[PDB]
Structure 1
Amino acid sequence: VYAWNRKRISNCVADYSVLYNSASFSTFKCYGVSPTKLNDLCFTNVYAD
């Protein structure tokens, strides 16, 4: 987690509304808005790892 690579997720629909409601991990936190607000947004890609 200190040294890994990351890559874009893109051209497919961001399920952030279900990702806000779902307890799919022990914790989550965000730099921008809450995930329910992210469910209304878009980007060229989200860089992820």
Structure 2
Amino acid sequence: DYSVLYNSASFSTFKCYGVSPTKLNDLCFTNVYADSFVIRGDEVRQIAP
């Protein structure tokens, strides 16, 4: 669930590509792969499909 993530850390950018962010709790996730990486703030805009 993502509604339990706002109390731990305030997310500044929560954009979901290919799926609505308000419909995550209405479907069923399949094969969730965590791809975490720390980059510069001037390079976040390049990360897009």
Same-fold status (TM-score > 0.5): no
Higher helix share: 1
Structure with bigger RCO (C-alpha 8 Å, 6+ apart) = 1
TM-score category (smaller protein): 0.3 to 0.5
**TM-score, structure 2 length as denominator?**
0.42
**TM-score, structure 1 length as denominator?**
0.42
